[PDB]
RNA sequence: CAUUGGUGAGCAGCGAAGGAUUUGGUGGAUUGGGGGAAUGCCUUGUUGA
């Protein structure tokens, strides 16, 4: 439950990490 | 408008802005030619830009500089940097490059920092 | 909205539509991490992990707080990260449109690289490197 | 040198979208790429041809039945013809537009083009030369259609045409106006769009497939018409048929999808043999073996650049990678092995001199900015922007250490000692270079001496002096192994990005803040400064390298060429890369002194030093006939035979005059050779050694020649170091091969005494 | 972590300040003794930004109070000056016994950390020289208001008796000018 | 005092029965987030015809 919510946010976190790093090379 | 370039030459505190314009070969220091300088022994050190690449080289240009600041050793070291830098600046823009490559080769081989000013930055080791 | 496009002189309305989604990615992520009990060290650490990125991103120029994530995150903070917007601020340029045309005919050098892209994005810390030609 | 320098090979197999086809032999692999055309074989992968006349990015290639007629098709849609060696015998401008389908005749007589909305048949000539304004003569045209032809099948009779188009109709055309079955019968009744139509080689079965994965077979019957054989209704696949091909065994089907899988089918049973999903990236093209033993498939540029070979019994024959653009190269301590750095965050191993990719290493969090080895060979190193810098082994598969300890996201430049004891790393935004120990990884002292960011870190072979280039108009000299630090020189102009060093500790080249390239000594006296960069399709000076022989430097910017210079002022050569829309980002030289390196978005690597060009080393025609005088010197005077043999440069002579003389004469000739005839044959003998099977032969040569003038070649290094490398790699590679079988044959007879 | 100290004076030294500079020189492994040919350098920011040093200590003399001890953190730029009371004649000494790499215990007396906590921030940042973290000597900072005291002492123990040794030049100082430094 | 900026006049040299400057068209080559129900909808069950 609480462990499940960790998996939900972190997957959204890692893509959001990926998207801003694209804009860092822009 | 005449073909003309302007540069500068710097010692420790000496400032000497050059005016390398076209003409027939006047080379003056604030109103005055080279052979009147006094230090009078350091005249040969500012003779050097006439000498390291061949004497003539000047029948199409004119030289006028002026000095603010420094000391009598420092004032002469300021201009002789600016003469060699001021000379190649004409070859930078009007004359071909390979002539200027021949000038700087004759300059750098004997170079007493004719093309770079002194900056001192200490550090303990 | 429309005047925000007019003030910032953006090339495309879809460029405004991009950054709202990019803000929308942060905003629901700002929601879900905030929907936690306060005793969680997972919650307290990772808010700071998100904030400390966004300082160097230049969105959070000044030092900010937790509730400012809902507040200070705007599209216009991203719109200020554009190249000519940064160019007008440090006052080597003269107008907004003057900052545009120098990128157009190529008079801006950021560090060692020549850049002519109008959609170039500037961070908070890399901004010391913009040089003339 | 004075050689011709060009690419007879490249870096990376498939970087852009292309087709796929085998040869007729089954032992050759035709692997194209979007801009150029390169041909490969099965064993010992080598780039054969280089067809480049394209301004638009697609290519199509096939041979007729014997592999001497080869074409390529771009979106411009004109034809180039090479034999085996990229000659461009015929340059036949075919069209302004591209072609959708194209196929030879199986007899090699006719030729098939499908473009516009029509059909164009052209004459196929035999093995000949040029002299033709139009070598292609129209045989027939076939009109009309409704729209563009999407796929094509032929006949073994070479008189029948079964085709299909976008109009969901399988039209029929006679080749020689025979009117076979007197009709142009279109096959219809399809629920969805027809992707592929294929004709079975029994002249009995008609294969049709649609895009819903439904297969319909119709009969060769023209009551009296073509009736149904089999129908299909699949509604559970939820995919789209991307590519489809038919087997010459006429028993199987091989189906490629948009979903990133590959499905196997049998034709009379309509059963799934096996499906193979390896991801979501789609399979673009597919090719079949001419007997159907091995299965290969091409893929998109946005999808995978990874093509895997297969069998009928489900096991991979050959694998390959080649992800995105190359950031740097690094030469192995033997030089035959090539590692790659890319934007993905992977490092890949490539013996691309034989084409093989043995393994890779993948521990990165972000891209790699540089790659570099250590000359011991035990360890190589990773220079990335991951926040750490990690050490690596060759074949033992263990990351030794990840070197870090400060908060840092950008590690740009790097240098090591040749001993491998200490490693120094230059942080980009932090003005500090960090030393790290080989023992544990200790940060003993931190060096805050910078005011601009670092740009290059280069350490010498003298092993006392560290050279550094920073972005503050100041060149930096450093001493660690002594008791102090050295006063760093002040540059005249030019914030420097690119720095280059001599492995003697005496010569140093700097790239200026423009296209000028200036070089100077350790007593900072400027030797040359090289003129700015030309070549409009603004200035770049990004990479530079001092060659290993010590007689040249190579300069690289990003204006789509490369520049060559010697120790005097002048340009050696300027080699321009012809390509349509930065190019260069890393340049260094090969330790075997046959080529050098180039990192690019494209990927291209070798510079092809050759011997077919006639040279005059020592006034050749004083030795008047190159044959009869040699045949005189094979009977008598074996000393003068080799002195005459070095003045010639025909390899068909060198093997025979080098072969002919006996064993006892070899130390005598090794005793009496002059030292000026020496370095080119000692250079050549190492590369010549790896190919032949006469190992004891050259072994007794190199013992006498190696024992001959060891003090002189010890006196004349930086050339016999390279020739020494070129022979020592052959030495260790044969050595570790024969010692193992020597012991494994050795223990046998004592084991016979055991039991 | 550990600071970096530069000793900088005017051109001409006096012996009553030469011995005093050598006691400040006894703050190694990070204290460099540098005599300049100029009274002050206009490029003091330049070398400390170049070398990466953390602190600069400058000595001079004026009239309103006696001579001062100027201490300034380089990455912060504050100004903390310390009026020296005893500059008359110190001991001629460069060392006695051990090294200055020893980390002593820090003892403060007459606690003022309302506004004198800034002094507590500096002296803990100053006299943390020594990563030894084991006491073999000790330096006491006794206050009498704006008065400060600096004394060096060594642990002397025999037959269970805690004895200190008044070692080094004995220092009497008063808080001179604190100019408000920057967060920059 | 600085052939210092602009303006105008004249001469040497260079060419001699014209010169210098600008512009147009045509021809070829080349290039979205957070909440939401009375009410609309979706899905499931239910009621009889």
PDB file of C-alpha atoms in Angstrom, chain D residues 344-544:
ATOM      1  CA  UNK D 344      23.311   6.343 -24.301  1.00  0.00           C
ATOM      2  CA  UNK D 345      25.591   5.512 -21.393  1.00  0.00           C
ATOM      3  CA  UNK D 346      27.143   2.293 -22.668  1.00  0.00           C
ATOM      4  CA  UNK D 347      30.681   1.312 -23.628  1.00  0.00           C
ATOM      5  CA  UNK D 348      31.031  -1.284 -26.355  1.00  0.00           C
ATOM      6  CA  UNK D 349      33.915  -3.483 -27.446  1.00  0.00           C
ATOM      7  CA  UNK D 350      34.619  -3.723 -31.178  1.00  0.00           C
ATOM      8  CA  UNK D 351      37.315  -5.566 -33.085  1.00  0.00           C
ATOM      9  CA  UNK D 352      35.997  -3.719 -36.121  1.00  0.00           C
ATOM     10  CA  UNK D 353      39.142  -4.601 -38.079  1.00  0.00           C
ATOM     11  CA  UNK D 354      37.363  -7.968 -38.252  1.00  0.00           C
ATOM     12  CA  UNK D 355      33.932  -6.491 -37.492  1.00  0.00           C
ATOM     13  CA  UNK D 356      33.207  -8.421 -34.293  1.00  0.00           C
ATOM     14  CA  UNK D 357      31.560  -7.001 -31.170  1.00  0.00           C
ATOM     15  CA  UNK D 358      32.545  -9.371 -28.364  1.00  0.00           C
ATOM     16  CA  UNK D 359      31.054  -7.639 -25.321  1.00  0.00           C
ATOM     17  CA  UNK D 360      30.033  -4.370 -23.686  1.00  0.00           C
ATOM     18  CA  UNK D 361      29.892  -2.760 -20.247  1.00  0.00           C
ATOM     19  CA  UNK D 362      26.849  -0.927 -18.904  1.00  0.00           C
ATOM     20  CA  UNK D 363      26.879   0.758 -15.491  1.00  0.00           C
ATOM     21  CA  UNK D 364      26.356   4.367 -16.505  1.00  0.00           C
ATOM     22  CA  UNK D 365      23.733   6.781 -15.246  1.00  0.00           C
ATOM     23  CA  UNK D 366      24.304   9.196 -18.152  1.00  0.00           C
ATOM     24  CA  UNK D 367      26.398   9.647 -21.291  1.00  0.00           C
ATOM     25  CA  UNK D 368      30.140   9.050 -21.688  1.00  0.00           C
ATOM     26  CA  UNK D 369      32.396  11.996 -22.495  1.00  0.00           C
ATOM     27  CA  UNK D 370      35.696  10.161 -23.152  1.00  0.00           C
ATOM     28  CA  UNK D 371      37.284   6.713 -23.217  1.00  0.00           C
ATOM     29  CA  UNK D 372      40.932   5.870 -22.553  1.00  0.00           C
ATOM     30  CA  UNK D 373      42.993   2.767 -21.785  1.00  0.00           C
ATOM     31  CA  UNK D 374      46.147   2.089 -19.856  1.00  0.00           C
ATOM     32  CA  UNK D 375      49.160   0.826 -21.803  1.00  0.00           C
ATOM     33  CA  UNK D 376      49.659  -2.115 -19.425  1.00  0.00           C
ATOM     34  CA  UNK D 377      46.433  -3.541 -20.838  1.00  0.00           C
ATOM     35  CA  UNK D 378      45.265  -4.787 -17.421  1.00  0.00           C
ATOM     36  CA  UNK D 379      42.966  -1.785 -16.958  1.00  0.00           C
ATOM     37  CA  UNK D 380      40.984   0.679 -19.034  1.00  0.00           C
ATOM     38  CA  UNK D 381      39.002   3.609 -17.687  1.00  0.00           C
ATOM     39  CA  UNK D 382      35.653   5.364 -18.002  1.00  0.00           C
ATOM     40  CA  UNK D 383      35.393   9.145 -18.375  1.00  0.00           C
ATOM     41  CA  UNK D 384      31.703   9.964 -18.141  1.00  0.00           C
ATOM     42  CA  UNK D 385      29.296  12.546 -16.771  1.00  0.00           C
ATOM     43  CA  UNK D 386      27.838   9.995 -14.342  1.00  0.00           C
ATOM     44  CA  UNK D 387      29.285  11.623 -11.234  1.00  0.00           C
ATOM     45  CA  UNK D 388      32.036   9.019 -10.919  1.00  0.00           C
ATOM     46  CA  UNK D 389      34.880   7.584 -12.982  1.00  0.00           C
ATOM     47  CA  UNK D 390      35.262   3.813 -12.872  1.00  0.00           C
ATOM     48  CA  UNK D 391      38.015   1.363 -13.787  1.00  0.00           C
ATOM     49  CA  UNK D 392      37.695  -1.750 -15.909  1.00  0.00           C
ATOM     50  CA  UNK D 393      39.232  -5.067 -16.921  1.00  0.00           C
ATOM     51  CA  UNK D 394      39.429  -6.692 -20.339  1.00  0.00           C
ATOM     52  CA  UNK D 395      37.904 -10.166 -20.070  1.00  0.00           C
ATOM     53  CA  UNK D 396      37.463 -10.650 -16.321  1.00  0.00           C
ATOM     54  CA  UNK D 397      34.183  -8.645 -16.011  1.00  0.00           C
ATOM     55  CA  UNK D 398      34.730  -6.594 -12.878  1.00  0.00           C
ATOM     56  CA  UNK D 399      34.385  -2.882 -12.274  1.00  0.00           C
ATOM     57  CA  UNK D 400      37.346  -2.294  -9.972  1.00  0.00           C
ATOM     58  CA  UNK D 401      36.345   1.030  -8.421  1.00  0.00           C
ATOM     59  CA  UNK D 402      34.081   3.986  -9.033  1.00  0.00           C
ATOM     60  CA  UNK D 403      36.199   7.022  -8.186  1.00  0.00           C
ATOM     61  CA  UNK D 404      34.226   9.914  -6.679  1.00  0.00           C
ATOM     62  CA  UNK D 405      33.744  11.612  -3.312  1.00  0.00           C
ATOM     63  CA  UNK D 406      32.582  15.140  -4.076  1.00  0.00           C
ATOM     64  CA  UNK D 407      29.229  16.414  -5.296  1.00  0.00           C
ATOM     65  CA  UNK D 408      29.730  16.525  -9.056  1.00  0.00           C
ATOM     66  CA  UNK D 409      27.588  15.734 -12.082  1.00  0.00           C
ATOM     67  CA  UNK D 410      30.070  16.722 -14.800  1.00  0.00           C
ATOM     68  CA  UNK D 411      33.469  15.018 -15.120  1.00  0.00           C
ATOM     69  CA  UNK D 412      34.894  16.226 -18.418  1.00  0.00           C
ATOM     70  CA  UNK D 413      38.633  15.618 -18.860  1.00  0.00           C
ATOM     71  CA  UNK D 414      41.046  13.079 -17.439  1.00  0.00           C
ATOM     72  CA  UNK D 415      44.695  12.051 -17.344  1.00  0.00           C
ATOM     73  CA  UNK D 416      46.700   9.192 -15.840  1.00  0.00           C
ATOM     74  CA  UNK D 417      50.312   8.283 -15.339  1.00  0.00           C
ATOM     75  CA  UNK D 418      51.772   5.516 -17.569  1.00  0.00           C
ATOM     76  CA  UNK D 419      52.448   3.547 -14.368  1.00  0.00           C
ATOM     77  CA  UNK D 420      48.752   3.498 -13.466  1.00  0.00           C
ATOM     78  CA  UNK D 421      49.520   4.594  -9.913  1.00  0.00           C
ATOM     79  CA  UNK D 422      47.628   7.902  -9.724  1.00  0.00           C
ATOM     80  CA  UNK D 423      44.702   9.204 -11.784  1.00  0.00           C
ATOM     81  CA  UNK D 424      43.834  12.901 -12.047  1.00  0.00           C
ATOM     82  CA  UNK D 425      40.416  14.170 -13.115  1.00  0.00           C
ATOM     83  CA  UNK D 426      39.428  17.663 -14.196  1.00  0.00           C
ATOM     84  CA  UNK D 427      36.047  18.901 -13.025  1.00  0.00           C
ATOM     85  CA  UNK D 428      34.263  21.205 -15.443  1.00  0.00           C
ATOM     86  CA  UNK D 429      32.446  23.753 -13.270  1.00  0.00           C
ATOM     87  CA  UNK D 430      34.621  23.078 -10.204  1.00  0.00           C
ATOM     88  CA  UNK D 431      38.105  24.563 -10.443  1.00  0.00           C
ATOM     89  CA  UNK D 432      39.963  21.564  -9.048  1.00  0.00           C
ATOM     90  CA  UNK D 433      41.766  18.520 -10.411  1.00  0.00           C
ATOM     91  CA  UNK D 434      41.547  15.426  -8.241  1.00  0.00           C
ATOM     92  CA  UNK D 435      44.163  12.725  -7.732  1.00  0.00           C
ATOM     93  CA  UNK D 436      43.125   9.178  -6.871  1.00  0.00           C
ATOM     94  CA  UNK D 437      45.213   6.228  -5.782  1.00  0.00           C
ATOM     95  CA  UNK D 438      45.477   2.760  -7.293  1.00  0.00           C
ATOM     96  CA  UNK D 439      45.617   1.360  -3.739  1.00  0.00           C
ATOM     97  CA  UNK D 440      42.189   2.239  -2.365  1.00  0.00           C
ATOM     98  CA  UNK D 441      41.193   5.416  -4.141  1.00  0.00           C
ATOM     99  CA  UNK D 442      42.499   8.054  -1.755  1.00  0.00           C
ATOM    100  CA  UNK D 443      42.249  11.827  -2.196  1.00  0.00           C
ATOM    101  CA  UNK D 444      45.576  12.905  -0.717  1.00  0.00           C
ATOM    102  CA  UNK D 445      45.683  16.552  -1.799  1.00  0.00           C
ATOM    103  CA  UNK D 446      43.353  18.762  -3.830  1.00  0.00           C
ATOM    104  CA  UNK D 447      44.778  21.167  -6.398  1.00  0.00           C
ATOM    105  CA  UNK D 448      43.001  24.520  -6.407  1.00  0.00           C
ATOM    106  CA  UNK D 449      45.069  26.478  -8.901  1.00  0.00           C
ATOM    107  CA  UNK D 450      42.514  27.229 -11.586  1.00  0.00           C
ATOM    108  CA  UNK D 451      40.569  30.382 -12.351  1.00  0.00           C
ATOM    109  CA  UNK D 452      39.073  29.180 -15.620  1.00  0.00           C
ATOM    110  CA  UNK D 453      37.557  25.759 -16.265  1.00  0.00           C
ATOM    111  CA  UNK D 454      39.851  22.970 -17.437  1.00  0.00           C
ATOM    112  CA  UNK D 455      39.806  21.903 -21.078  1.00  0.00           C
ATOM    113  CA  UNK D 456      42.518  19.275 -21.572  1.00  0.00           C
ATOM    114  CA  UNK D 457      44.657  17.078 -19.348  1.00  0.00           C
ATOM    115  CA  UNK D 458      47.747  15.509 -20.865  1.00  0.00           C
ATOM    116  CA  UNK D 459      50.637  13.723 -19.192  1.00  0.00           C
ATOM    117  CA  UNK D 460      53.972  12.949 -20.798  1.00  0.00           C
ATOM    118  CA  UNK D 461      56.053   9.834 -21.408  1.00  0.00           C
ATOM    119  CA  UNK D 462      58.947  11.539 -19.582  1.00  0.00           C
ATOM    120  CA  UNK D 463      56.749  10.914 -16.487  1.00  0.00           C
ATOM    121  CA  UNK D 464      57.753  14.016 -14.577  1.00  0.00           C
ATOM    122  CA  UNK D 465      55.572  16.693 -16.159  1.00  0.00           C
ATOM    123  CA  UNK D 466      51.810  17.183 -16.250  1.00  0.00           C
ATOM    124  CA  UNK D 467      50.457  19.478 -18.961  1.00  0.00           C
ATOM    125  CA  UNK D 468      47.028  21.083 -18.674  1.00  0.00           C
ATOM    126  CA  UNK D 469      44.946  23.458 -20.790  1.00  0.00           C
ATOM    127  CA  UNK D 470      42.279  25.565 -19.091  1.00  0.00           C
ATOM    128  CA  UNK D 471      39.744  28.140 -20.210  1.00  0.00           C
ATOM    129  CA  UNK D 472      41.576  31.176 -18.818  1.00  0.00           C
ATOM    130  CA  UNK D 473      44.352  31.926 -21.419  1.00  0.00           C
ATOM    131  CA  UNK D 474      46.847  30.089 -19.177  1.00  0.00           C
ATOM    132  CA  UNK D 475      48.740  26.895 -19.969  1.00  0.00           C
ATOM    133  CA  UNK D 476      49.623  24.882 -16.896  1.00  0.00           C
ATOM    134  CA  UNK D 477      52.679  22.789 -16.042  1.00  0.00           C
ATOM    135  CA  UNK D 478      52.767  20.635 -12.920  1.00  0.00           C
ATOM    136  CA  UNK D 479      55.030  18.295 -10.975  1.00  0.00           C
ATOM    137  CA  UNK D 480      53.746  15.720  -8.490  1.00  0.00           C
ATOM    138  CA  UNK D 481      56.540  13.167  -8.115  1.00  0.00           C
ATOM    139  CA  UNK D 482      59.095  15.799  -7.091  1.00  0.00           C
ATOM    140  CA  UNK D 483      58.955  18.011  -4.026  1.00  0.00           C
ATOM    141  CA  UNK D 484      57.149  21.075  -5.419  1.00  0.00           C
ATOM    142  CA  UNK D 485      55.070  22.660  -8.168  1.00  0.00           C
ATOM    143  CA  UNK D 486      56.211  24.502 -11.272  1.00  0.00           C
ATOM    144  CA  UNK D 487      55.446  28.008 -12.499  1.00  0.00           C
ATOM    145  CA  UNK D 488      52.821  27.756 -15.217  1.00  0.00           C
ATOM    146  CA  UNK D 489      53.410  29.669 -18.474  1.00  0.00           C
ATOM    147  CA  UNK D 490      51.232  32.506 -19.719  1.00  0.00           C
ATOM    148  CA  UNK D 491      49.796  32.280 -23.213  1.00  0.00           C
ATOM    149  CA  UNK D 492      49.777  35.265 -25.528  1.00  0.00           C
ATOM    150  CA  UNK D 493      46.265  34.880 -27.003  1.00  0.00           C
ATOM    151  CA  UNK D 494      43.584  32.338 -27.072  1.00  0.00           C
ATOM    152  CA  UNK D 495      41.617  30.564 -24.388  1.00  0.00           C
ATOM    153  CA  UNK D 496      42.442  26.963 -25.279  1.00  0.00           C
ATOM    154  CA  UNK D 497      40.096  24.014 -25.593  1.00  0.00           C
ATOM    155  CA  UNK D 498      42.421  21.583 -27.396  1.00  0.00           C
ATOM    156  CA  UNK D 499      45.935  20.640 -26.283  1.00  0.00           C
ATOM    157  CA  UNK D 500      48.429  18.131 -27.695  1.00  0.00           C
ATOM    158  CA  UNK D 501      51.696  16.727 -26.344  1.00  0.00           C
ATOM    159  CA  UNK D 502      54.799  14.880 -27.503  1.00  0.00           C
ATOM    160  CA  UNK D 503      55.679  11.567 -25.779  1.00  0.00           C
ATOM    161  CA  UNK D 504      59.205  12.877 -25.172  1.00  0.00           C
ATOM    162  CA  UNK D 505      58.152  15.812 -23.029  1.00  0.00           C
ATOM    163  CA  UNK D 506      59.429  18.460 -25.443  1.00  0.00           C
ATOM    164  CA  UNK D 507      56.850  19.438 -28.093  1.00  0.00           C
ATOM    165  CA  UNK D 508      53.389  20.820 -27.393  1.00  0.00           C
ATOM    166  CA  UNK D 509      50.661  22.013 -29.758  1.00  0.00           C
ATOM    167  CA  UNK D 510      47.810  24.331 -28.806  1.00  0.00           C
ATOM    168  CA  UNK D 511      44.590  25.077 -30.623  1.00  0.00           C
ATOM    169  CA  UNK D 512      44.013  28.822 -30.467  1.00  0.00           C
ATOM    170  CA  UNK D 513      40.659  30.633 -29.964  1.00  0.00           C
ATOM    171  CA  UNK D 514      40.196  30.333 -33.756  1.00  0.00           C
ATOM    172  CA  UNK D 515      41.394  28.170 -36.631  1.00  0.00           C
ATOM    173  CA  UNK D 516      45.050  29.021 -35.987  1.00  0.00           C
ATOM    174  CA  UNK D 517      47.033  26.026 -34.706  1.00  0.00           C
ATOM    175  CA  UNK D 518      50.273  26.979 -32.945  1.00  0.00           C
ATOM    176  CA  UNK D 519      52.994  24.619 -31.707  1.00  0.00           C
ATOM    177  CA  UNK D 520      55.974  25.287 -29.440  1.00  0.00           C
ATOM    178  CA  UNK D 521      58.669  23.704 -27.282  1.00  0.00           C
ATOM    179  CA  UNK D 522      59.031  23.273 -23.516  1.00  0.00           C
ATOM    180  CA  UNK D 523      60.959  26.539 -23.701  1.00  0.00           C
ATOM    181  CA  UNK D 524      57.690  28.138 -25.044  1.00  0.00           C
ATOM    182  CA  UNK D 525      59.130  29.257 -28.400  1.00  0.00           C
ATOM    183  CA  UNK D 526      56.342  29.117 -30.983  1.00  0.00           C
ATOM    184  CA  UNK D 527      57.194  27.004 -34.007  1.00  0.00           C
ATOM    185  CA  UNK D 528      54.123  27.346 -36.268  1.00  0.00           C
ATOM    186  CA  UNK D 529      50.678  28.890 -36.242  1.00  0.00           C
ATOM    187  CA  UNK D 530      48.295  27.445 -38.816  1.00  0.00           C
ATOM    188  CA  UNK D 531      45.741  29.465 -40.822  1.00  0.00           C
ATOM    189  CA  UNK D 532      42.014  29.404 -40.020  1.00  0.00           C
ATOM    190  CA  UNK D 533      39.496  26.858 -41.210  1.00  0.00           C
ATOM    191  CA  UNK D 534      37.870  27.312 -44.664  1.00  0.00           C
ATOM    192  CA  UNK D 535      35.097  25.112 -46.180  1.00  0.00           C
ATOM    193  CA  UNK D 536      31.624  26.661 -46.116  1.00  0.00           C
ATOM    194  CA  UNK D 537      29.012  23.991 -46.874  1.00  0.00           C
ATOM    195  CA  UNK D 538      32.248  29.838 -37.805  1.00  0.00           C
ATOM    196  CA  UNK D 539      35.678  28.605 -36.731  1.00  0.00           C
ATOM    197  CA  UNK D 540      36.450  25.368 -34.876  1.00  0.00           C
ATOM    198  CA  UNK D 541      39.608  23.997 -33.248  1.00  0.00           C
ATOM    199  CA  UNK D 542      38.043  21.280 -31.147  1.00  0.00           C
ATOM    200  CA  UNK D 543      40.505  18.388 -31.380  1.00  0.00           C
ATOM    201  CA  UNK D 544      44.193  17.966 -32.125  1.00  0.00           C
TER     202      UNK D 544
END
